[PDB]
Every structure is written in structure tokens, then in C-alpha cells.
Design a protein around this ligand. Structure first.
Ligand SMILES: Nc1nc2c(ncn2[C@@H]2O[C@H](COP(=O)(O)OP(=O)(O)O)[C@@H](O)[C@H]2O)c(=O)[nH]1
Ligand SMILES: *CCC(=O)Nc1ncc2c(n1)CCN(Cc1ccccc1)C2
Ligand SMILES: *CCC(=O)Nc1ncc2c(n1)CCN(Cc1ccccc1)C2
Ligand SMILES: [Mg+2]
Length: 166
């Protein structure tokens, strides 16, 4: 069956691990070692087609450039994650997008902009600002909460749809 290699990227603390564990195991984790970079496989049905999701949960810049270039080359689609209560994490998105584009040597890479922690009242990044950034990239924007599950399946399935559309 078709396998989609998905990579979750974004600043430390945005909720990459929490989103991944919520997608895979259907539980919210209050803590997951921020330094651990692991991959997980799940069989799912997306738009009536049974497929394998192979998801790499990235740890960040504190590892060999050869490791980061390897997963950016192998990865078919990227979840670019920021937290809605962290403007610095939103400002960082363009850095992740740029690095993926360089490695893949392509102006058209399947990606989804994800604004996580949408359950938190203290928003510092508006939906409008995020939608404008995603529109300029020609990619979807989805707000998620790894805590409540809101938008979690939608964000990963939208990225699979972008790969199928590619
Ligand atoms: N309220 C809330 N907390 C979250 C959410 N996602 C992650 N967290 C918390 O934010 C912290 C960092 O999340 P983590 O998955 O480790 O981020 P990572 O460094 O991107 O992997 C942890 O304490 C998580 O429980 C979310 O959607 N809502
Ligand atoms: C907040 C995110 C964070 O601190 N991430 C993080 N910190 C330290 C490390 C890593 N991520 C990734 C793994 N390295 C160890 C390593 C492994 C192989 C090659 C070089 C470095 C530490
Ligand atoms: C994860 C994001 C999330 O929980 N969003 C969200 N939760 C509850 C509400 C809304 N979004 C929007 C609509 N209402 C609140 C509201 C906002 C503006 C005007 C009227 C009502 C519930
Ligand atoms: Mg993590």
C-alpha cells in the first residue's frame, strides 16, 4: 500500500512531539523529551484509500547537518508548525520553508502551515496573519490543538492530500 513520508518541523516547544503522539496514539502528552527525534508508522484511511503514514518528529538544529538534509530529502511533505501564543515561532517558519526548498531543490514542495496550541486563550498570532503567510506560499493553513485533538487529523490528512496533488 502507498506510504507517505511526513516530516514535522518548527521551533522547539511548538508541540511537534505532542501533535505526532496525538496523531499516532490518540493521547495528549504533557512532556516528551525535547531532544528526541523519532519516526512512527500508522495505517489510516484517507478519502477511501488505505495508506501508511510514516511520520518523522524532528528534534531541531542541535544535530548534524547531514541528518537534517537526509530527512528533508527523504520527506515527501512537511508540517511547518508554530504555536499561536509564540510570535518568535511564527517568525521562524520562513527559515524552515527556505531550508526544505534548498535541500529538495524545488519551488513546489508539499507543505501545510500549522498553528498549534489553539486551545490557549493568550493568542499572539492571528488567524489572518497566518492565512496571509500560507497564501503567499500556496499552501493550506490549519489551526490545531494537540491537547483537545482539534484539527490534528485534518492537518496530517491535508498534507497527504497535498502529496497526492503533487
Ligand atoms: N495547551 C497546549 N499545550 C500543548 C500543545 N501542544 C503541545 N503542548 C505542550 O507544549 C510543550 C512542548 O510541546 P512538545 O511536543 O514537546 O514540543 P516540540 O519541542 O515541538 O516537540 C509540552 O509541555 C506540551 O504538553 C497544545 O496544542 N496545547
Ligand atoms: C528544544 C529542542 C532541543 O533542545 N532539541 C535538541 N537538543 C539537543 C539535541 C537534539 N535536539 C538532537 C540530538 N542531539 C544529539 C546529537 C545526535 C546526533 C548528532 C549530533 C547531535 C542533541
Ligand atoms: C483550537 C481552536 C479553537 O478552539 N477555536 C475556537 N474554539 C471555540 C470557539 C471558536 N474557535 C470560535 C467561535 N466561538 C467563540 C467566538 C469567537 C468570536 C465570536 C463569537 C464567538 C467558540
Ligand atoms: Mg519534540
Amino acid at each position: 500500500m502507498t506510504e507517505y513520508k511526513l516530516v514535522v518541523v518548527g521551533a522547539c516547544g511548538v508541540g511537534k512531539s505532542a501533535l505526532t503522539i496525538q496523531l499516532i496514539q490518540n493521547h495528549f502528552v504533557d512532556e516528551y523529551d525535547p531532544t528526541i527525534e523519532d519516526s512512527y508508522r500508522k495505517q489510516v484511511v484517507i478519502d477511501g484509500e488505505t495508506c501508511l503514514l510514516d511520520i518523522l518528529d524532528t528534534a531541531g538544529q542541535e544535530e548534524y547537518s547531514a541528518m537534517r538534509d537526509q530527512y528533508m530529502r527523504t520527506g515527501e511533505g512537511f508540517l511547518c508548525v508554530f504555536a499561536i501564543n509564540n510570535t518568535k515561532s511564527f517568525e521562524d517558519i520562513h527559515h524552515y520553508r527556505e531550508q526544505i526548498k534548498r535541500v529538495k531543490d524545488s519551488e513546489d514542495v508539499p507543505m501545510v502551515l500549522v498553528g498549534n496550541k489553539c486551545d490557549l486563550p493568550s493568542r499572539t498570532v492571528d488567524t489572518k496573519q497566518a492565512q496571509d503567510l500560507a497564501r503567499s506560499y500556496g499552501i493550506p493553513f490549519i489551526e490545531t490543538s494537540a491537547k483537545t485533538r482539534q484539527g490534528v487529523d485534518d492537518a496530517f490528512y491535508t498534507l497527504v492530500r497535498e502529496i497526492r496533488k503533487h
